[PDB]
Amino acid sequence: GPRFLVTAPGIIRPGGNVTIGVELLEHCPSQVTVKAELLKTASNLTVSVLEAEGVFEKGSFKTLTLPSLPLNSADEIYELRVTGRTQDEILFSNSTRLSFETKRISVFIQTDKALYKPKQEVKFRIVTLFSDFKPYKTSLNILIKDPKSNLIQQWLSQQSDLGVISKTFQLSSHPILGDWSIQVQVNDQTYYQSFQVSEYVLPKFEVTLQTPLYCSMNSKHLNGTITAKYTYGKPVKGDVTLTFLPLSFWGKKKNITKTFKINGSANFSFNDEEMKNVMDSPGPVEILTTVTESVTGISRNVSTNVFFKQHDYIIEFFDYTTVLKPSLNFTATVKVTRADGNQLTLEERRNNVVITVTQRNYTEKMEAVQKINYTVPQSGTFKIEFPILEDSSELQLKAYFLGSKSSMAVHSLFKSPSKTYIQLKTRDENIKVGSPFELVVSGNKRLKELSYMVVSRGQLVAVGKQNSTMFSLTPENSWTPKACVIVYYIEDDGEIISDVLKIPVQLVFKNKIKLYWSKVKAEPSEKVSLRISVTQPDSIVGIVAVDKSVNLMNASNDITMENVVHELELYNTGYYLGMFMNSFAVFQECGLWVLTDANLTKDHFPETWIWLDTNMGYRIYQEFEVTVPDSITSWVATGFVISEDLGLGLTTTPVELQAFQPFFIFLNLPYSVIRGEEFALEITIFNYLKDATEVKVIIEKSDKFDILMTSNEINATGHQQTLLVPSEDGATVLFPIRPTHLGEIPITVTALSPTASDAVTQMILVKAEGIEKSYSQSILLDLTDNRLQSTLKTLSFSFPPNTVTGSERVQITAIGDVLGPSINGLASLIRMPYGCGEQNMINFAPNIYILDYLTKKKQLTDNLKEKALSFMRQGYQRELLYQREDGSFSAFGNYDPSGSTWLSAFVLRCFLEADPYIDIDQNVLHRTYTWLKGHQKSNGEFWDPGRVIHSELQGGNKSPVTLTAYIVTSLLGYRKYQPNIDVQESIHFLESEFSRGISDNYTLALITYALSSVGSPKAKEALNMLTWRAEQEGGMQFWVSSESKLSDSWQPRSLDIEVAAYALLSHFLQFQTSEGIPIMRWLSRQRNSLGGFASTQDTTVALKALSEFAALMNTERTNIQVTVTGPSSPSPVKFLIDTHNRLLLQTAELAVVQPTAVNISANGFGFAICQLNVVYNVKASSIQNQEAFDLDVAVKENKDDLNHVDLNVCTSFSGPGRSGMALMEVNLLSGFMVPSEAISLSETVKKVEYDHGKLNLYLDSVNETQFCVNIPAVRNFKVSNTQDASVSIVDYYEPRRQAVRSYNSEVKLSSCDLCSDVQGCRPC
Ligand SMILES: *[C@@H]1O[C@H](CO)[C@@H](O[C@@H]2O[C@H](CO)[C@@H](O)[C@H](O)[C@H]2NC(C)=O)[C@H](O)[C@H]1NC(C)=O
Ligand SMILES: *[C@@H]1O[C@H](CO)[C@@H](O[C@@H]2O[C@H](CO)[C@@H](O)[C@H](O)[C@H]2NC(C)=O)[C@H](O)[C@H]1NC(C)=O
Ligand SMILES: *[C@@H]1O[C@H](CO)[C@@H](O)[C@H](O)[C@H]1NC(C)=O
Ligand SMILES: *[C@@H]1O[C@H](CO)[C@@H](O)[C@H](O)[C@H]1NC(C)=O
Ligand SMILES: *[C@@H]1O[C@H](CO)[C@@H](O)[C@H](O)[C@H]1NC(C)=O
Ligand SMILES: *[C@@H]1O[C@H](CO)[C@@H](O)[C@H](O)[C@H]1NC(C)=O
């Protein structure tokens, strides 16, 4: 008879012990020894990697566990060989292939949110656990990818402490929207986790559109309620425009227009016949509704999908035994419900379900269609348990009920020659780890000593023998997430009677964590404490706390039991046996290879509050104090704990804290107001109680504004107003406020309810009328010479006659470094916006140059280093937006017709220079270089297919020379990645063009810089020729290029600054310092109050030049005592500059007098820059003044209408040919906003940016043909006595080519139109 039944799983997994079940039956000779070995057939040879051996006794089902394969093993040809021998005979010796499973460890990536906004911090944790949820100490590499698959930021060789790595990643202001990715590279495997980044637009008001998802054709009443409500809680009293349309292409797809007043939330009861007509299983009905408030002009839309059930009743079959074993009892829990969701018990029971049983013998013999009437229970799962005849092959159950006469067919007859069958079954549902569960073994014949075996995650985790038909098993963590219990025994004839039950085992963790809130309900901005109680000391805990609104989207970025189950389900993988009609199939159904001599025959943006990460040491209980955020929400806290001994443990339930207040105050402030205007502060009191309350709103009296409410009551000045707030919102109390002082003003509104009180303080910026003008004058106190111990300079400025009194502001700064002022103003070097492609580099390349200068000078502080690198990463993230699909970079990304070689070269050079500091994706560099090198002509000339944005390089005459000289310099930094960049023909072309004769200063400067960078022998001649054209004046060298359309200003042209910077770089690259110093002196004295130069490009080039050249100066000691005494500073203001405060920008606010003047007296050694900054506002503003642009703003708006102001801005460029990229800044009138997508992008308007009451239009180019753009603005705040706003168009790369005009609406709100109908409020 049979003697052995050695069974092994068919898979191999690194890090998992291979266990082999050995059963020696009764008719076995003696104690055998079973050896097992894992052979690796990598090459043609076979290497016995692992092996095990054991002596097993007769009549005992035991296990043989191999040593675990090392976790770093790769996919090889693995073959498990088992050989069992006794004192003489070898009973069996066989081998089989093992399928390789690459899921070795469990890696969880936990981001605090699934959906992110721009300017948000992605906080992410990485948890690395073994298959048994113990911490896995390893060195992982973290990578972050944007949706275009660009390496944004990586961390390398991160050593995980108890398997947990906590990190943060700062998103930029304008990232690439889409699905980002986090990749964790443990060993040779990579684990992914995507988080979505999407832009957030203010929804204004929301619509709910509640409808039942599953309805029935026979349901008379169907209603869809649409709840329109403003964000402040007030319902919208608007007329819904509704379209109730199907997607049934065979139908008409007409829309029933139930367009009337919603009145907050109305009923929309429908008719059955009407819906039959509209229909004439459907495509789901799409409900689309829209409310449009007339004044705002804003409309919100929602799509709601409504599927359809055929009948009023729904009968569904599940939990059915997929194997039809004759002489056994079929069982299936069949649910009865109704499309409305209300079973209604007796009322819809209507007596019995016949549950027609169709038994068939599958002939072409025993054909029975008998029906058994059974009553419907209240639960609906009647769980019929009818028997099966001895030869029934096919079963069809047809439950005939009043609705949904559903059918089910099962066709799988288990084949057994002896007609012997068993069946493993379970009654329990909550099958957990450590909790025993019962198993019942039904059988149609005599049952012998059963033998069970459990397979889980492709590993044989338990064996044994049971002598009874009812036995209990206790799962362990290895059994999860889905065990497979195979019960079998062997009859006398060597037939294996067996059955499989697949049991979902719930996972219970030994490690336990409990979170407790101090208070279940707390007020906002209250200090509560979160209490963490863990099992054992030396545990690392990660706790997240998020708004209750989350999880309605089923966010996958959290360590919850669902995510743990999903992770564990990746272990349980393998081919599944569709058929189970034989014992061999029964064994194989859970991946088992059986070696036996028996007859085995083949046949929605949720904000985050707490991101706590604490390494609890000796403590098993720790309390952390936190502040409840101001918003009225509900915060649920969840967390995990990891310890070395017990492993992982999750919180069973999230614990909730309700942030509740009796009422809440909302203020609606205009952000900016001009001095002299009178705005209307509206305060809204959202009342959350269930009964009307009488709140009392008070504004704290301040000297920086006057409230115009001349109250009727005596004593009280009208700063207080009492009102009755009904339940659930309703208050819009208005205070007319006239600011008096300028700057930032705080307004503090305090509401005193009888029960509670609250206060809200908000800041309003009050500016001065007119256009803001600036002046800056710098001097370099070059006290290095010992003879020049004392130095006296004078800085003067005379205000224009049309200055706005009170808007003047004079200050003076001193700093002890040549590149000083650029250090402080790294965050913002220029006042222009940088939403375009090239301009964004103004927050990137200067960081490179400052870090290079400070590292060379050995003065780089850690804090400044980290700030600079953070700016570098933000600049890189923002810049990668403007990369086109063909690898190019353009000024406006993919909106441009084609990329620009000039800007691609600029970005390539900057990224190559930023390699040693931050991490740049090399694929971006490779694609950019590949795109560039296709544009080199036969003679070496580079040409730019992109749109001209810099008229000097790209446009004008000598364009090929400047483009070649720029791109040749930019490509040299790529010689690291490719030592054979063939630019010798380009160099020869530049040399020939230089020998031709260069007249312009800018072209010659670029030629000199190119020839110096490539070390061409003509470079010395070019630089000598460029120097001799300079202006030697006052120990300074500079180049002045004349133009008759530049507004007079302190600052020179961008072209002149670039010329000086390139000449200085040429002097540096040729190792000529003494004759380069004057250019350094001049270049250092032409910066603005922010430490930057005029435009973006000139600023980057000049900062590069000053960083490269200032590093060669000797400033080892500097001790300067600057004294500032003059008419504008009566008291002598003294700045001390030492070797410690070298980079400190020492500032002092001077008085305002006409004319401003200061004498600066300095004594000592070293370099010091002293700068006088004046900021003022001229009153008002083509004509005889020097303006390159002719601008005209015509405000056309009806006098009767006070809410809409449409202005037509017509501009033209009276200059040589076309201009470069231009910027139009439209300042809106106080209390006016331009709705989004109001200005359509066109061939001219390339980008519209909506700042706070300001529009930045990036015009492509302006020429002599008049270009007119319409700006429609809609009132959102009531502001009386509005002051004139301004429209200013400038050339981006030459700000002195500018034109500014003033405008104002011809109709104004009066002083007392601000007040509402409230009593006691009398401004007129
Ligand atoms: C290049 O720069 C030099 C130096 O500023 C310019 O030379 C000056 O040109 C102006 C206007 O023609 C004269 O009034 C000065 O006397 C010149 N100063 C010199 C030669 O030292 C030169 O014009 C510039 N060239 C171009 C093409 O812009
Ligand atoms: C600032 O400097 C100016 C010029 O260097 C000084 O003006 C001279 O002052 C002296 C003495 O006060 C007079 O004798 C001269 O006639 C002045 N010349 C001019 C052109 O004004 C001025 O006094 C200095 N102011 C301070 C406060 O030191
Ligand atoms: C599993 O394998 C590891 C390493 O191969 C070994 O240390 C351990 O003892 C094995 N487990 C059993 C139960 O033999
Ligand atoms: C096992 O080995 C025997 C003897 O070499 C062979 O007859 C049989 O086909 C092998 N495979 C099995 C039993 O699956
Ligand atoms: C099967 O059902 C029949 C009839 O309901 C019952 O007599 C018998 O005991 C049942 N057997 C099992 C194993 O459920
Ligand atoms: C001005 O630019 C517009 C827009 O491209 C073009 O249609 C027109 O021909 C240009 N006119 C001149 C004189 O350059």
JSON list of N, CA and C and ligand atoms in Angstrom, two decimals, residues 327-331 385-388 423 425 440-443, ligand 5:
[
{"chain": "A", "resi": 327, "resn": "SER", "atom": "N", "xyz": [-23.78, 13.40, -2.87]},
{"chain": "A", "resi": 327, "resn": "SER", "atom": "CA", "xyz": [-24.10, 12.87, -1.55]},
{"chain": "A", "resi": 327, "resn": "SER", "atom": "C", "xyz": [-23.71, 13.83, -0.43]},
{"chain": "A", "resi": 328, "resn": "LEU", "atom": "N", "xyz": [-23.52, 15.11, -0.74]},
{"chain": "A", "resi": 328, "resn": "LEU", "atom": "CA", "xyz": [-23.17, 16.14, 0.22]},
{"chain": "A", "resi": 328, "resn": "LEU", "atom": "C", "xyz": [-24.18, 17.27, 0.11]},
{"chain": "A", "resi": 329, "resn": "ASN", "atom": "N", "xyz": [-24.11, 18.21, 1.05]},
{"chain": "A", "resi": 329, "resn": "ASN", "atom": "CA", "xyz": [-25.09, 19.28, 1.16]},
{"chain": "A", "resi": 329, "resn": "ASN", "atom": "C", "xyz": [-24.54, 20.56, 0.55]},
{"chain": "A", "resi": 330, "resn": "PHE", "atom": "N", "xyz": [-25.17, 21.03, -0.52]},
{"chain": "A", "resi": 330, "resn": "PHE", "atom": "CA", "xyz": [-24.88, 22.35, -1.06]},
{"chain": "A", "resi": 330, "resn": "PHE", "atom": "C", "xyz": [-25.34, 23.41, -0.08]},
{"chain": "A", "resi": 331, "resn": "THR", "atom": "N", "xyz": [-24.59, 24.51, 0.01]},
{"chain": "A", "resi": 331, "resn": "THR", "atom": "CA", "xyz": [-24.94, 25.61, 0.89]},
{"chain": "A", "resi": 331, "resn": "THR", "atom": "C", "xyz": [-24.51, 26.92, 0.23]},
{"chain": "A", "resi": 385, "resn": "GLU", "atom": "N", "xyz": [-29.90, 24.90, 2.33]},
{"chain": "A", "resi": 385, "resn": "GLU", "atom": "CA", "xyz": [-28.95, 23.81, 2.56]},
{"chain": "A", "resi": 385, "resn": "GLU", "atom": "C", "xyz": [-29.51, 22.49, 2.04]},
{"chain": "A", "resi": 386, "resn": "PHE", "atom": "N", "xyz": [-30.06, 22.52, 0.83]},
{"chain": "A", "resi": 386, "resn": "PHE", "atom": "CA", "xyz": [-30.63, 21.32, 0.25]},
{"chain": "A", "resi": 386, "resn": "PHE", "atom": "C", "xyz": [-29.52, 20.33, -0.09]},
{"chain": "A", "resi": 387, "resn": "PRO", "atom": "N", "xyz": [-29.83, 19.03, -0.18]},
{"chain": "A", "resi": 387, "resn": "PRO", "atom": "CA", "xyz": [-28.79, 18.05, -0.48]},
{"chain": "A", "resi": 387, "resn": "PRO", "atom": "C", "xyz": [-28.60, 17.84, -1.98]},
{"chain": "A", "resi": 388, "resn": "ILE", "atom": "N", "xyz": [-27.57, 17.07, -2.31]},
{"chain": "A", "resi": 388, "resn": "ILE", "atom": "CA", "xyz": [-27.21, 16.74, -3.68]},
{"chain": "A", "resi": 388, "resn": "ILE", "atom": "C", "xyz": [-27.32, 15.23, -3.84]},
{"chain": "A", "resi": 423, "resn": "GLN", "atom": "N", "xyz": [-15.74, 17.15, 2.79]},
{"chain": "A", "resi": 423, "resn": "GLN", "atom": "CA", "xyz": [-15.93, 18.58, 2.56]},
{"chain": "A", "resi": 423, "resn": "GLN", "atom": "C", "xyz": [-15.54, 19.32, 3.83]},
{"chain": "A", "resi": 425, "resn": "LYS", "atom": "N", "xyz": [-15.59, 22.68, 5.92]},
{"chain": "A", "resi": 425, "resn": "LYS", "atom": "CA", "xyz": [-16.49, 23.82, 6.00]},
{"chain": "A", "resi": 425, "resn": "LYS", "atom": "C", "xyz": [-16.25, 24.54, 7.32]},
{"chain": "A", "resi": 440, "resn": "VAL", "atom": "N", "xyz": [-15.64, 22.00, 10.40]},
{"chain": "A", "resi": 440, "resn": "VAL", "atom": "CA", "xyz": [-16.48, 20.81, 10.35]},
{"chain": "A", "resi": 440, "resn": "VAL", "atom": "C", "xyz": [-16.16, 20.07, 9.06]},
{"chain": "A", "resi": 441, "resn": "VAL", "atom": "N", "xyz": [-15.98, 18.76, 9.16]},
{"chain": "A", "resi": 441, "resn": "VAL", "atom": "CA", "xyz": [-15.63, 17.92, 8.02]},
{"chain": "A", "resi": 441, "resn": "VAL", "atom": "C", "xyz": [-16.82, 17.02, 7.74]},
{"chain": "A", "resi": 442, "resn": "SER", "atom": "N", "xyz": [-17.63, 17.41, 6.76]},
{"chain": "A", "resi": 442, "resn": "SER", "atom": "CA", "xyz": [-18.73, 16.57, 6.31]},
{"chain": "A", "resi": 442, "resn": "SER", "atom": "C", "xyz": [-18.19, 15.46, 5.42]},
{"chain": "A", "resi": 443, "resn": "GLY", "atom": "N", "xyz": [-18.85, 14.31, 5.46]},
{"chain": "A", "resi": 443, "resn": "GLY", "atom": "CA", "xyz": [-18.43, 13.20, 4.63]},
{"chain": "A", "resi": 443, "resn": "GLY", "atom": "C", "xyz": [-19.52, 12.18, 4.38]},
{"chain": "B", "resi": 5, "resn": "LIG", "atom": "C1", "xyz": [-27.89, 17.64, 4.85]},
{"chain": "B", "resi": 5, "resn": "LIG", "atom": "O1", "xyz": [-29.26, 18.03, 4.77]},
{"chain": "B", "resi": 5, "resn": "LIG", "atom": "C2", "xyz": [-30.18, 17.00, 5.18]},
{"chain": "B", "resi": 5, "resn": "LIG", "atom": "C3", "xyz": [-31.57, 17.54, 4.94]},
{"chain": "B", "resi": 5, "resn": "LIG", "atom": "O2", "xyz": [-31.70, 18.88, 5.39]},
{"chain": "B", "resi": 5, "resn": "LIG", "atom": "C4", "xyz": [-29.92, 16.64, 6.64]},
{"chain": "B", "resi": 5, "resn": "LIG", "atom": "O3", "xyz": [-30.78, 15.56, 7.01]},
{"chain": "B", "resi": 5, "resn": "LIG", "atom": "C5", "xyz": [-28.47, 16.23, 6.83]},
{"chain": "B", "resi": 5, "resn": "LIG", "atom": "O4", "xyz": [-28.20, 16.02, 8.22]},
{"chain": "B", "resi": 5, "resn": "LIG", "atom": "C6", "xyz": [-27.53, 17.31, 6.30]},
{"chain": "B", "resi": 5, "resn": "LIG", "atom": "N1", "xyz": [-26.15, 16.89, 6.41]},
{"chain": "B", "resi": 5, "resn": "LIG", "atom": "C7", "xyz": [-25.13, 17.74, 6.56]},
{"chain": "B", "resi": 5, "resn": "LIG", "atom": "C8", "xyz": [-23.77, 17.12, 6.67]},
{"chain": "B", "resi": 5, "resn": "LIG", "atom": "O5", "xyz": [-25.30, 18.95, 6.60]}
]
